[PDB]
Amino acid sequence: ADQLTEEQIAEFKEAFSLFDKDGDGTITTKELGTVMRSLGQNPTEAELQDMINEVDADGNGTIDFPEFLTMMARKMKDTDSEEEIREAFRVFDKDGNGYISAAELRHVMTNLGEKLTDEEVDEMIREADIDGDGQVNYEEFVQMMTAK
Amino acid sequence: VKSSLLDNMIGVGDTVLLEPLNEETFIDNLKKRFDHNEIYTYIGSVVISVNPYRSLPIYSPEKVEDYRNRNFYELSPHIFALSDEAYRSLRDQDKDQCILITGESGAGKTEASKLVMSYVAAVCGKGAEVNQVKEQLLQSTPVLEA
Amino acid sequence: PNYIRCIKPNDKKAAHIFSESLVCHQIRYLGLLENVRVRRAGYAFRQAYEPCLERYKMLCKQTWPHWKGPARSGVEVLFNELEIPVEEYSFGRSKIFIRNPRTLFQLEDLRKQRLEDLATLIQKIYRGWKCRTHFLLMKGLNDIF
Amino acid sequence: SIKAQTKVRKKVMGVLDIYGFEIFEDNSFEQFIINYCNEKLQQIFIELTLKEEQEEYIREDIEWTHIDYFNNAIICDLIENNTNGILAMLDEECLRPGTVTDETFLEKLNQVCATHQHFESRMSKCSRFLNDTTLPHSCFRIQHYA
């Protein structure tokens, strides 16, 4: 791209400097995704692996700040939609009532995808419905998660 | 309309979908379903039941609510789904029904009568009457069996 | 008439014995095979347009996330993107008709493929809500790092 | 003990528990009546099946293609015909006294019942010409749906 007007440069620079703990001037490579997800771009893990293996020729993933800006102008046009993920939840509704089972949400969200851990899907259901238990809603839950 | 018996299907759930069509594939279908404790398999609107010779937990009153008033297509094969069709064709349509059990003794005919009439004893609204006629029917069964 | 055929899996009344030769005779005596042969007759699968479109809306970029109305047209553009031959299906008045389960298990394979992409999308936007939330709390504690 | 108290308007769901098909090594007249009743049940089952299917393909305005199935009606017709059936010949041999035996009844079946394709005997010729092994004398074969 061109790229990247300054008001995103400052956020990429403070998030770029936040996850630097050795005093290098670059992030560590295990935390490479959470850099991008703390700012709200959210790439997938395998596409992150391809994108980091494009610029690396050593098998470590060590980049700098302009390469990270290049990766941000690549993914900047990939901002997801609201109705798309909401209809993706409506795929997992099997009863057509607007209700969704919490335990089957655990089964899907711990057996499919990037495989969320126990605290993340348990915290997911506890944020979905504070009263409980075992059966949750999603239609306001999608409004809660899709805010940057 | 959002669920189907095709999801989570052990083997092939409906034999009209079985390919290729002979007895050799079908024995393997009932084999691989009976191994995974799936003893019901449809042909069109036909229930195939296999006797497991034990009490399976697919007859809970919890699953009566699950099997009730879904469509024939929307859920995994079970015998109640036949009775849940028949009763509604008796209830909402006011047409007389009959449920035919064909097989040999020791394959589960009397059990199928007990489970069909048990579902009708569940969802009719006056369960104690159907249990009262039912108890004298199952009581009169070994009398006729003599 | 509503209908039940019962099969014994052995001649010994046990729970885990499956004798294939006896069950073969149980199929022969009841005649399940010609039952399948007559239920299959022309088109081996069928369903209404609405559960078909609601089941397979995610395989077409004109039905994802909407719609494409009416339901026969959405199933049609679904087939036209997924490159299904014309002799595989037929349009009824209120149902879509499928001739051989080759097309059916093909579509179940493709839907099984896109399901992981939908769950991956949900876990991506959710975990991004968590990392973005932790980033906003981290800004909320320390204004400069 | 189980009937209703008075005689009112009603709607009924019945349950017909019927036995299944039989094959022994030696199948006598009992198993003949048994297998004949299962021929009738198979016939009404396939007939209601085809009327139901062709009903649906006429509903959805789709051109029917023809399907090949086993005809049960000519086995039933092979047994029940008031002039050419098996039971008409048996009612004849029971009715008239002529010092009648089993082999004379087989002679009558060879005379009038062997003109059909699916009947099969040894002394007739026609149906069938061949001298097939494991087909003894004083017996006959019926090609059932089973």
Curated annotation (Swiss-Prot), chain D:
It comes from the Eukaryota. Belongs to the TRAFAC class myosin-kinesin ATPase superfamily. Myosin family. Motor protein that may participate in process critical to neuronal development and function such as cell migration, neurite outgrowth and vesicular transport. This is Unconventional myosin-Ib. It comes from Rattus norvegicus (Rat). The lineage of its organism: Eukaryota, Metazoa, Chordata, Craniata, Vertebrata. The chain holds residues 371 to 516 of 1136 of the full protein.
